[PDB]
C-alpha cells in the first residue's frame with residue numbers, strides 16, 4: 001500500500017537539476033523516472049515524519065496534468081521519485097530555445113496549466129511557485145505541473161528567480177500567510193503573459209529590487225499591449241483579470257477554465 005521504495009531498487013543517472021533544496025536526477029525504476037533527492041545530509045527524526053507528511057500531500061494527487069508521484073525513498077538519502085518527462089519545460093521552450101508555438105497550441109497549454117491548477121485547488125493544494133519553469137511539456141503536447149509539494153519542509157527547515165510570478169501581496173511580505181488560491185491565479189497570469197508575449201515581464205528593468213519594490217506598491221505591472229497581434233481580445237482581458245493587483249478581484253480557476261475553454265471554441 002505505502003509508497004516507500006527500498007534501498008538498491010532505484011538507479012540514479014545523469015544529473016539535471018541544481019541548487020539547495022534537493023538535487024534532481026534522471027533515474028530508472030520500472031522504466032525511466034526522475035528522482036529528487038533532498039541533500040539534507042542525514043536527518044533527525046521529527047524531520048523524517050515531516051518528510052512523510054509531505055508525501056501524504058503528494059499522493060493526494062492523481063491527474064493527467066499534475067506530475068505523477070510514483071513513490072518516495074528515505075534510505076540512501078531522502079528523495080521523491082516521479083515519472084520522467086521526455087521533452088523540455090515551458091520556460092525552456094519559451095525563453096531559451098525560442099520555440100515558436102502556434103496560437104492554438106499556446107491556448108491549449110494555458111488551458112492544461114489551468115486545468116491542472118484547478119485540480120490542485122479542488123484538492124486544497126496551493127502551488128505557491130507556479131511558473132513556466134515548473135510546467136513540463138511532456139512529449140510536447142501534455143502539460144505536467146510539478147514542484148508544488150513539500151512547502152512545509154522549507155518554512156521549518158534550514159524566492160528569487162521566482163519573483164516575476166509573485167503576486168504583489170506576496171512580494172511585500174505583509175503577514176503570516178500571503179499565499180492563496182488567488183496568488184496562484186496571478187502566477188498563472190504571468191505564464192499567460194509568457195505564452196502570449198513569448199517574453200518574461202519587465203525585460204527592460206535591470207535593477208531587480210525596483211521590480212520587487214514597484215510590483216509591491218502597484219507602481220509596476222505587466223505591459224499587456226505586447227500580446228502578439230493575433231492573441232484574442234478575450235485573452236488580453238482574461239490576462240488582466242488574473243493579474244489584478246488587489247487579490248480579491250482575481251477569478252478562481254473553475255472560472256478561468258471556463259473563459260479559456262470558451263475562447264478556444266471560437267477561433
Ligand SMILES: CCCS(=O)(=O)Nc1ccc(F)c(-c2cc3cnc(NCCCO)nc3n(C)c2=O)c1F
Nearest residue numbers: 024034035036058069082084085089146147148149
Ligand atoms: C507530485 C509533486 C512532487 S514535487 O516534489 O512537488 N515535484 C517534483 C518532485 C520530484 C521530481 F523529480 C520532480 C521533477 C520531475 C521532472 C520530470 N521530467 C523533467 N524533465 C526535464 C525538465 C526540463 O526542465 N524534469 C523534472 N524535474 C526538473 C523535476 O524537478 C518534481 F517536479
